[PDB]
Design a protein around this nucleic acid. Sequence first.
DNA 1: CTGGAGAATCCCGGTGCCGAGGCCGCTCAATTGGTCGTAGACAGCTCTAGCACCGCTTAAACGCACGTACGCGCTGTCCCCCGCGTTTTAACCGCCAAGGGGATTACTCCCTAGTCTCCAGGCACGTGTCAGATATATACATCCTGTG
DNA 2: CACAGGATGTATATATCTGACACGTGCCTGGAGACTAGGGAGTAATCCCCTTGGCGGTTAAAACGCGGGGGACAGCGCGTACGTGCGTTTAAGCGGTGCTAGAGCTGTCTACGACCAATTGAGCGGCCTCGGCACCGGGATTCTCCAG
Lengths: 92, 92, 95, 95, 78, 78, 106, 102
Amino acid sequence: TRKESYAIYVYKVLKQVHPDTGISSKAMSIMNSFVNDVFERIAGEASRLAHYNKRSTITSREIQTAVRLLLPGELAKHAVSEGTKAVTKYTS
Amino acid sequence: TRKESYAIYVYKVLKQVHPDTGISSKAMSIMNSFVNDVFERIAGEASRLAHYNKRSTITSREIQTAVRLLLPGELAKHAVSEGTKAVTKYTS
Amino acid sequence: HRYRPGTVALREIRRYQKSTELLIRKLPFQRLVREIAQDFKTDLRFQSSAVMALQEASEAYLVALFEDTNLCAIHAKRVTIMPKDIQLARRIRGE
Amino acid sequence: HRYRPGTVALREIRRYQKSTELLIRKLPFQRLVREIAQDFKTDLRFQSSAVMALQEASEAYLVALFEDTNLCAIHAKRVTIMPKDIQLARRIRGE
Amino acid sequence: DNIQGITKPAIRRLARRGGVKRISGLIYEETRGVLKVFLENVIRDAVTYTEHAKRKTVTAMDVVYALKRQGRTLYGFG
Amino acid sequence: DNIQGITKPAIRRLARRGGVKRISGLIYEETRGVLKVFLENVIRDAVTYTEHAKRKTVTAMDVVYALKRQGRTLYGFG
Amino acid sequence: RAKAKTRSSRAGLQFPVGRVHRLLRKGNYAERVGAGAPVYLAAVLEYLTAEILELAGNAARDNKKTRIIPRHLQLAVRNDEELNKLLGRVTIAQGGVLPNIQSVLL
Amino acid sequence: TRSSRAGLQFPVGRVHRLLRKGNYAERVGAGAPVYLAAVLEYLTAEILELAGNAARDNKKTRIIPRHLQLAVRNDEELNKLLGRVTIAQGGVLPNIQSVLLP
DNA sequence: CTGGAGAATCCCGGTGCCGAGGCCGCTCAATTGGTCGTAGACAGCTCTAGCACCGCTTAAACGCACGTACGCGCTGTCCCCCGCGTTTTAACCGCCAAGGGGATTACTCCCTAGTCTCCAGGCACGTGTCAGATATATACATCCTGTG
DNA sequence: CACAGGATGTATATATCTGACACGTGCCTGGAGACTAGGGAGTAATCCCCTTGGCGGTTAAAACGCGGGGGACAGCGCGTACGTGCGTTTAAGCGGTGCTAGAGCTGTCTACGACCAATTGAGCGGCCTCGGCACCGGGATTCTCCAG
């Protein structure tokens, strides 16, 4: 049975940041678990934020606040800039 | 606005275990936040149990497995006993 | 009359482990909280219960930290807690 | 030729902090896991990867505990870790 | 300069509740630094919650959610 | 008597990777007890996950979930 | 129809099965909630509440009080090994601490 | 693809599906998956950059778990984000307490 | 080592108050009773991989001897922290007054779920080659003891 | 007491080889496009509550200063237990062969849970009200300490 993973996206990002660097299957498995874990953390925080404010929708604002709650300092501000850039480009 | 709590059920259970013992409003607030905390812990663990096994339904056996995961030992076994007894009584 | 150096410390230990009231003065703590919050957002207001929750959290944290610091100090065969005891406790905790 | 008592110990520390391979023998550890699991359910089978994950986790846990233990032993001005050091580390961690 | 309002006797009372019998004179500045770092973390999260709600008043619930997020669940405030 | 398979040389290697320079002879029984308790917790949770799935085989996913439940997330096994 | 009977009464439980069910449905936990899951969960919640309240009432009687306060709740939790394991990362407001002086300090 | 509209490498549509079917809310806004894919992509790129440096620092050209662990534990903010994560085959950092040295 | 002083804490009892606890409207959420459609239970079948065994090679464990450096006990100094009495400060309490904004209601609209069709991105599967695993011999780099 | 050099260990080209990584292929299922329907939320106005600012009086607490003792720490000696190394044993590791238990999938079908509309009583808010607890004072008991 077919099993979806994040391997190709992690691999595209790796060939973007280090065009000559590769990654082993075990390291790719680690990267997949990292993406899944961070996704779960951010989505859990956005869910709880939406619940606390009696909202039905997870929006860019909930996601942005979850990122600001979960990531430390500079990681948080840069992630926020990436997210806002992507949403502006998406609506544009 | 109407604010729901477990206060009445806590008082009934207390009158079962301690017929004359009363309770201050702070202790009742603590018991309410404790019930809410434990609800969220068990419900989240049952939710991720159902997700792990690719099920759509939270059932009595998801709640039972969640209890065995979250509660420490004798707490877990007495809680599992009570839960299955209650489900048996309700089903009959 | 004078008690020897440590009898009254033990008296306060017993007393404050019997008691439950907050141990920091409320108004200085509130000024501290508002001053700290100035750097995140200006003209902020606080509910009294928010400040009280902060004080409860802070005092519970400091009391547990002093317990761990006491264990670290006793480990080095001392009865006097030192900044290095606090640093060791917080390092083991992962802070 | 003889090294002094501690030179080869430091050599081992450097060697094993450079490498990543597992440090417990796989078959004794597997027998240990199966023996422990006998107490929870009879006739259990294990995936090779399940045992490998158990061993990875156990070794990472033991290494982090030994690092905390070395800190607690240095705090008491020793260089030798003792069971009291391990117990202090696990107490401050909250185990 | 309001951190100095957290006085030396208050820190001694806290350490007494922690069972400490004898207290170095240098403990008090370290404890002030620790308390300020802790309050900075909690208050940063609380004001983030406040800003998300578009409010201007930090509520007890903002503080309780901040504490629970940092693994310091607090009973007795809702 | 399989706990004795975790030998003194193996515990010494673990301590070396942990940065320990000199090890007391009483460390080995303490470490075997610690490891037994750890494995008991993890395996208890893994067998709970396994029994819930109505399997007879403890899977890598059970172990990973058990490690995650104890706040000890493991990367590299799914 | 008939006489409206609560599921708590059918289960022999004091905790409200219907409210726990509704909190599960609107809590984003699963797409569907089985019929026995709220009964089971209410039984588990009732058992934990009963344990804490029994131990806290004992602690209150020991201080010759007829009314549970946060101190008695804290003494129940911190004196009970398994409750103290369950509530290990939780702060009880106005609960204080357990009396504990290290023997080397005496 | 929505990833091309958002200018991303991470799957905006797949992330949206995982959010909808992950039991996170009743509804998911259109910008939520875009923002989330951007943040996930940024954190992935950070770790992969540091890990490629660590691989180069081991004379390797291909990343392995050891390179990932070195990357994570040497960067302060990633170490805070992954404080209670264990990387399999990652080893530890070469740290000897100075009081133990000759 | 006793034996009184002296201080602190606790135990009793009377007062008084304010919050726990019981009762009364009332309303909205839980129950009743059907309907339906799909999630999951079940049976059968495939075949993956876990278990069992077996022979051999050797790396690792084990047991032993020796010495040294580290743990630990003891001593002494001195300084810094505790116990306590006094003075100052501002916390605390009670009250008054203004109004900012949290919370509610109503309305309206636009944004998201749902559906259906269609197709291309992504997954499983092959495959070849080059980065890395493994010697291998060597050039250092390091530790330790003898010697000047 | 400080270098010389010897033995030991480790980093470093260099050569073999291989298997796992990177890319290409086929295809299918889930992601995108185009709508419609409906309700979640954005917005404005309003109300009242609860936050802030001020003010004055009282006293608990903070700050300060002053012995003095006892605890931290530095130094020193000693003994034993752990590190290092060496020879012997033993089972781990590895590689194969073989067997079948059970994991995993598929096809059926049914029964279980969502949903919906009407009904009603369980639980909630409000409101008294009396008794458990706080407080205050005063005396008994216990504990600490120093002087003989």
